Design a protein around this ligand. Structure first.
Ligand SMILES: [Sm+3]
Ligand SMILES: [Sm+3]
Ligand SMILES: [Sm+3]
Ligand SMILES: [Sm+3]
Ligand SMILES: [Sm+3]
Ligand SMILES: [Sm+3]
Lengths: 136, 136
């Protein structure tokens, strides 16, 4: 399992996401309880621009490990990429429950309100991002 | 940079142009090569009725990206707002080099001749606008 998984990671790192996906699937055939493999499978789809598939596999990682801030954040990002801004918000809010110091997460929460023409909410959250990291 | 810039855009969208300007300046402190930030800074001044300042920042955006039709057009508009009709013309002509299908640009070129009592030139260009968009 671990060996297929790391082959996957190595392809993922080369930017070969179809090949990463193949190998993560192998790994998960052998051990369907590794959160990290589902999560990485999700990211591989994300990097292919397959946001709906990415969302499906982030959900499985999160079912296995609900305290992953980054998984919730990346779930948000997938919904954001498909234009589902209200769902992006929900999942950014869950990332910020776990890590209220993610500037990324506040910033993207801001964006997700901006995209709906909610400027005051967007300002609030951009200001939180910038307080955390004023170099953006 | 991007984060200050988007805070700016969010205030700009609320109609808070002084606050937009403050934040675009921040953004530009950090990255003085973003055309879009100079251009937006220009628009923020424009919306305040600070046409000379708007012109200064449109020039900088255009120095960075000379193929922006909208920037040339908005440059025109700033000069037009201050009564400098001959300069408006020059910059409308540059917008129309890039996008000869801007009805807006032909129409305002027309206006800028009208304002100088050049009625035949104004007619020519109003007719071009109306051919492109006869709903005005
Ligand atoms: Sm391949
Ligand atoms: Sm799909
Ligand atoms: Sm609101
Ligand atoms: Sm104000
Ligand atoms: Sm002035
Ligand atoms: Sm004449």
């Amino acid at each position: 399992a671990e060996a297929w998984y790391n082959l996957g990671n190595a392809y993922y790192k080369q930017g070969d996401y179809d090949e990463a996906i193949e190998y993560y699937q192998k790994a998960l055939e052998l051990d369907p309880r590794s959160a990290e493999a589902w999560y990485n499978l999700g990211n591989a789809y994300y990097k292919q621009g397959d946001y709906d598939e990415a969302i499906e596999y982030y959900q499985k990682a999160l079912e296995l490990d609900p305290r992953s801030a980054e998984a919730w954040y990346n779930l948000g990002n997938a919904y954001y990429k498909q234009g589902d801004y209200d769902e992006a918000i929900e999942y950014y809010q869950k990332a910020l429950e776990l890590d209220p110091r993610s500037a990324e997460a506040w910033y993207n929460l801001g964006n997700a309100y901006y995209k709906q023409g909610d400027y005051d909410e967007a300002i609030e959250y951009y200001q939180k991002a910038l307080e955390l990291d004023p170099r953006s």
